[PDB]
Design a protein around this ligand. Structure first.
Ligand SMILES: [Cl-]
Ligand SMILES: [Cl-]
Ligand SMILES: [Cl-]
Ligand SMILES: [Cl-]
Ligand SMILES: [Cl-]
Ligand SMILES: [Cl-]
Ligand SMILES: [Cl-]
Ligand SMILES: [Cl-]
Ligand SMILES: [Cl-]
Ligand SMILES: [Cl-]
Ligand SMILES: [Cl-]
Ligand SMILES: [Cl-]
Ligand SMILES: [Cl-]
Ligand SMILES: [Cl-]
Ligand SMILES: [Cl-]
Ligand SMILES: [Cl-]
Ligand SMILES: [Cl-]
Ligand SMILES: [Cl-]
Ligand SMILES: [Cl-]
Ligand SMILES: [Cl-]
Ligand SMILES: [Cl-]
Ligand SMILES: [Cl-]
Ligand SMILES: [Cl-]
Ligand SMILES: [Cl-]
Ligand SMILES: [Cl-]
Ligand SMILES: [Cl-]
Ligand SMILES: [Cl-]
Ligand SMILES: [Cl-]
Ligand SMILES: [Cl-]
Ligand SMILES: [Cl-]
Ligand SMILES: [Cl-]
Ligand SMILES: [Cl-]
Ligand SMILES: [Cl-]
Ligand SMILES: [Zn+2]
Ligand SMILES: [Zn+2]
Ligand SMILES: [Zn+2]
Ligand SMILES: [Zn+2]
Ligand SMILES: [Zn+2]
Ligand SMILES: [Zn+2]
Ligand SMILES: [Zn+2]
Ligand SMILES: [Zn+2]
Ligand SMILES: [Zn+2]
Ligand SMILES: [Zn+2]
Ligand SMILES: [Zn+2]
Ligand SMILES: [Zn+2]
Ligand SMILES: [Zn+2]
Ligand SMILES: [Zn+2]
Ligand SMILES: [Zn+2]
Ligand SMILES: [Zn+2]
Ligand SMILES: [Zn+2]
Ligand SMILES: [Zn+2]
Ligand SMILES: [Zn+2]
Ligand SMILES: [Zn+2]
Ligand SMILES: [Zn+2]
Lengths: 214, 209
C-alpha cells in the first residue's frame, strides 16, 4: 500500500500567518488523486481539497493545495481561529485509499510555566479501599512537559494515567492531570507522595508533595 | 444531502454488530460510499468502500475478513458489520460518500466493546499563592460519557474537565478541576454536578477545603 508521511507532526503559528503542511507518498500518486481533510475536536472530518489543488464546495480561498507525484502541500494562507485543528491527507488512487497520520496546527504563544497542585485521596474514597492521588499542571506552554511520581522518593511506573486538555481558547495554554492509583493497603505502606514537574518555563523542577496522614 | 448514522453501540466481545448509514438527497446507487475508523486519540483509518449499484467492494487488507460492508439500495442504506467484535473495535465509525475522496460525511457512530457492564461513577472531592485549585474525581463508570458542570453551570472560567481515561479495570475515570481565588475558599460554595445518563445517575458533590 501507499504510505503517506505528514510533516511536521505539529505546526506552531500565530493568527494571520501562513501554514504550509506537507504530505509525502512512498510511491507516486497518479492523476493528483490526493485529498486533504480538516478535523476539529468532537467533530467529523470535512473535505478541504481534492485533486491536489481543487477546493471543495464551500471552502474559502485561504485554503489551497499543490503538488504531484510523491510531494504534496496544503496551504492555509491566513490562519483564522477556526483553522487551528488537525489536518489529514489521503490518496484515493490505489486501493487501499490510505490516510496520512495527521498534522496539528496549534497557536504559538510565549513560554508559560505550569502551576502545579497535588491532591491527596479523599476520606470518602479511602473508606472504599482505594487511593487516587492527583497531580495537576495548570496553563502551560509549550505542550512538552515531564511529570514523575515518587513514593517515599522511589519513582513510580505503570500505576498512573495522564490526560491533557486541548489548547485554551483564552490564553492558548495546555493543562494536564496525572492520577496515581493504589489500593488503600498499598497506600498506607508509604508516607511521602510527590509529583515532580519539569518544563521549559521552569528554571528547575517543581515538586509538590504531602505526607500521608499528616 | 444527509448521511444519517445509527446510534451509539455498547457490546460485549464476541458479539455481532451491524451499523447503518442512511442517505438522502443524491443518487445512492451511482456513488461509492464507505467507512472510516478513528480510535479515540488516534488518526483516521480507511476501512473500505462499496458501490451500491452492484455492491462491488474495495477493502483495506487490515479490515478484510474482519468486517463486511454492504448496501441496500431500496432504502438507500449502507452498512458495516462484524461477526465477532473485539475490544480493539472500540472506535468512532464514520460513513462518507466516496468520489473516491470522501466529500460528504456522516456524524459518526461510537462503538464500545468491553466485558464491563453499565456502572455509574463515584464522585470524590479534590479538596483545596494567589490561586487555589479544587476539583472532582469522577471514577469507575461505564460506558462513556459523563458530563460535568460547576455550580450548575454558573462557574465556567478556569474549569478544565479532562478527557476520560480507560482504566485497566475496564472502567473509565476523569477529573474536573477549577482554579479560583484563594480568598474565595472561605466564602463561596463550589459544587461539581455530574450526570451519567447510561446509568441514570446524577451526583452533586460539595468540594470543601
Ligand atoms: Cl502496511
Ligand atoms: Cl518521508
Ligand atoms: Cl513537530
Ligand atoms: Cl487574521
Ligand atoms: Cl494530474
Ligand atoms: Cl470555513
Ligand atoms: Cl478565506
Ligand atoms: Cl481570511
Ligand atoms: Cl486540534
Ligand atoms: Cl503570548
Ligand atoms: Cl471526603
Ligand atoms: Cl522514566
Ligand atoms: Cl502487612
Ligand atoms: Cl505500593
Ligand atoms: Cl512497594
Ligand atoms: Cl519531573
Ligand atoms: Cl447480523
Ligand atoms: Cl465508478
Ligand atoms: Cl482502535
Ligand atoms: Cl487505531
Ligand atoms: Cl476513551
Ligand atoms: Cl477482545
Ligand atoms: Cl482486542
Ligand atoms: Cl461533510
Ligand atoms: Cl474488555
Ligand atoms: Cl464491570
Ligand atoms: Cl507566589
Ligand atoms: Cl468520554
Ligand atoms: Cl463535561
Ligand atoms: Cl473523553
Ligand atoms: Cl473518550
Ligand atoms: Cl446533576
Ligand atoms: Cl456533597
Ligand atoms: Zn505497510
Ligand atoms: Zn522521509
Ligand atoms: Zn517532525
Ligand atoms: Zn486537537
Ligand atoms: Zn470524538
Ligand atoms: Zn483573520
Ligand atoms: Zn468555517
Ligand atoms: Zn487553568
Ligand atoms: Zn506526559
Ligand atoms: Zn481558559
Ligand atoms: Zn493565562
Ligand atoms: Zn509499596
Ligand atoms: Zn526527577
Ligand atoms: Zn471514548
Ligand atoms: Zn490503528
Ligand atoms: Zn461494478
Ligand atoms: Zn489485495
Ligand atoms: Zn477489528
Ligand atoms: Zn475505583
Ligand atoms: Zn466574594
Ligand atoms: Zn444535582
Amino acid at each position: 500500500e501507499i504510505v503517506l508521511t505528514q510533516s511536521p507532526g505539529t505546526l506552531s503559528l500565530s493568527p494571520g500567518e501562513r501554514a504550509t503542511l506537507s504530505c509525502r507518498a512512498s510511491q507516486s500518486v497518479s492523476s493528483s488523486y490526493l485529498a486533504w481533510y480538516q478535523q476539529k475536536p468532537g467533530q467529523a472530518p470535512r473535505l478541504l481539497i481534492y485533486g491536489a489543488s481543487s477546493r471543495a464546495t464551500g471552502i474559502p480561498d485561504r485554503f489551497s493545495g499543490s503538488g504531484s507525484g510523491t510531494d504534496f502541500t496544503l496551504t492555509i494562507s491566513r490562519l483564522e481561529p477556526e483553522d487551528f485543528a488537525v489536518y489529514y491527507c489521503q490518496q484515493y488512487d490505489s486501493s487501499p485509499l490510505t490516510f496520512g497520520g495527521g498534522t496539528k496546527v496549534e497557536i504559538k504563544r510565549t513560554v508559560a510555566a505550569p502551576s502545579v497542585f497535588i491532591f491527596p485521596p479523599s476520606d470518602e474514597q479511602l473508606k472504599s479501599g482505594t487511593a487516587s492521588v492527583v497531580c495537576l499542571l495548570n496553563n502551560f506552554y509549550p505542550r512538552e512537559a515531564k511529570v514523575q511520581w515518587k513514593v517515599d522518593n522511589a519513582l513510580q511506573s505503570g500505576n498512573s494515567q495522564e490526560s491533557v486538555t486541548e489548547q485554551d481558547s483564552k490564553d492558548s495554554t495546555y493543562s494536564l492531570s496525572s492520577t496515581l492509583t493504589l489500593s488503600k493497603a498499598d497506600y498506607e505502606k508509604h508516607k511521602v507522595y510527590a509529583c515532580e514537574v519539569t518544563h521549559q518555563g521552569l528554571s528547575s523542577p517543581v515538586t509538590k508533595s504531602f505526607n500521608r496522614g499528616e | 444531502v444527509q448521511l444519517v448514522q445509527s446510534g451509539a453501540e455498547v457490546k460485549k466481545p464476541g458479539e455481532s454488530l451491524k451499523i447503518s448509514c442512511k442517505v438522502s438527497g443524491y443518487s445512492f446507487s451511482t456513488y461509492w460510499i464507505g467507512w472510516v475508523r478513528q480510535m479515540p486519540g488516534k488518526g483516521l483509518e480507511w476501512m473500505g468502500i462499496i458501490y451500491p449499484g452492484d455492491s462491488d467492494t474495495r477493502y483495506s487488507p487490515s479490515f478484510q475478513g474482519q468486517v463486511t460492508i454492504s448496501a441496500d439500495k431500496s432504502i438507500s442504506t449502507a452498512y458495516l458489520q462484524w461477526s465477532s467484535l473485539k475490544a480493539s473495535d472500540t472506535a468512532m465509525y464514520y460513513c462518507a460518500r466516496s468520489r473516491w475522496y470522501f466529500d460528504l460525511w456522516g456524524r459518526g457512530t461510537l462503538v464500545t466493546v468491553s466485558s464491563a457492564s453499565t456502572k455509574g461513577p463515584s464522585v470524590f472531592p479534590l479538596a483545596p499563592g494567589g490561586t487555589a485549585a479544587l476539583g472532582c474525581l469522577v471514577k469507575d463508570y461505564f460506558p462513556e460519557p459523563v458530563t460535568v458542570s460547576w455550580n450548575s453551570g454558573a462557574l465556567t472560567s478556569g474549569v478544565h474537565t479532562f478527557p476520560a481515561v480507560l482504566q485497566s479495570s475496564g472502567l473509565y475515570s476523569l477529573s474536573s478541576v477549577v482554579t479560583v481565588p484563594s480568598s474565595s475558599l472561605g466564602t463561596q460554595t463550589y459544587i461539581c454536578n455530574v450526570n451519567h445518563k447510561p446509568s441514570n445517575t446524577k451526583v452533586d458533590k460539595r468540594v470543601e477545603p
